[PDB]
Design a protein around this ligand. Structure first.
Ligand SMILES: [Cl-]
Ligand code: NA
Ligand code: NA
Ligand code: NA
Ligand code: NA
Ligand code: NA
Lengths: 160, 157, 157
């Protein structure tokens, strides 16, 4: 069986639909008792923002602009295609509602509760200017060598 | 005895081309190939001569009617230009005698690449099994994971 | 002991950057790294001190002249806006003294990352070996599969 397996996802994309796929896979994995690590890098870091604990305190101006102007939480992420001003996302969301397919923010709550391990790429965090306190509290800041050690120890590795 | 699993998430012509170039070559080396199509990737599996509108919601009918109807109609991931920079790629491929996507797909089907459609995507998007190629099987995410964990090479495209 | 294979399909500045951050770090940990560049990913390998238009078709000549001529010219995957939001990412990296894509590429070359160019893509897009960095080897998809199957980490970017 799959109960001792390990999966590692590098979530690079900050697209709603790619994030959804990554959490559909991670939640299903956790239900099969697979240990799941999601390493968020670049745009994927946007998945990890906690809107209730955002800040502008002691960031450069570029960092402030980036933080205020980008999606402030997972649910605000744009579609990878057909976003159409936010209308084609509105489409996908409606079709999901018809099937009772849970929204990204509910899949993310689910993944946190099932103890999917979420890591934020240190260099991406530094470049984009996010503080630890701006992300969910159980997120750990991980450098790329820690990503590689984890990925090499894993049974399934994907870049999303 | 090797095995490869590709998760085709993208519905882009060029990414689909890459996936089938790799899948066809792997079958020639006697590697067993599984392609799990999810979200936009499902569009690869549409049989245009079998399309249907019966028992679909409004958005499902609209999504069906207004997305690529078959693999050859997929857009480029880049410089598609409303079909024109896809038209560039196709001309460049013609000069080099590189087969089109639909010909790679026919080859994949003949070589018995195993094509699967992600159940949740199929349901969300409203596609029926009869609208897809006959040998496609519906598989859920847990079945994908089992198959991927048993594979020797796993990619997300 | 360990081996990593990256298939770089994307020709985006930020995706190439991710790939070379990973590749450079892997080399420091003594992991063997193979990067197979295909389709848009081939643009990473263009040597701007070498370019040629000689013995190419019209679309090949046009493609060569109009596309990014070296890694540093690659567009952002998103929010490129004229190259100005790339300008934004670049200025943010500069504040952090994060190395540029060209510096990571030079580092990768120095650390003996193995760079291969997909033969079919090369032929379609019309690039010649002489237009790419001298250590690049042209490899077909079956060589890609052999190498990926012997690797411990395999990603498609
Ligand atoms: Cl991957
Ligand atoms: Na910064
Ligand atoms: Na991937
Ligand atoms: Na539906
Ligand atoms: Na993989
Ligand atoms: Na050509």
């Amino acid at each position: 069986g799959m109960e001792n397996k390990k999966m590692n996802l590098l979530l690079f994309s900050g697209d709603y639909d790619k994030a959804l796929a990554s959490l559909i896979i991670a939640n299903a994995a956790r239900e099969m008792e697979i240990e799941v690590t999601i390493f968020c890098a670049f745009w994927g870091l946007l998945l990890l923002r906690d809107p209730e604990k955002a800040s502008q305190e002691d960031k450069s101006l570029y960092e402030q602009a980036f933080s205020s102007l980008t999606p402030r939480e997972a649910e605000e992420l744009p579609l990878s295609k057909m976003n159409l001003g936010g209308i084609g996302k509105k489409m996908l969301l409606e079709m999901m509602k018809e099937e009772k397919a849970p929204k990204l923010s509910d899949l993310l709550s689910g993944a946190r509760k099932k103890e999917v391990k979420f890591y934020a790429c240190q260099l991406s965090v530094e470049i984009m200017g996010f503080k630890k306190e701006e992300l969910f509290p159980e997120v750990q800041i991980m450098d790329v060598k820690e990503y590689l050690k984890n990925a090499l120890e894993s049974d399934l590795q994907l870049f999303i």
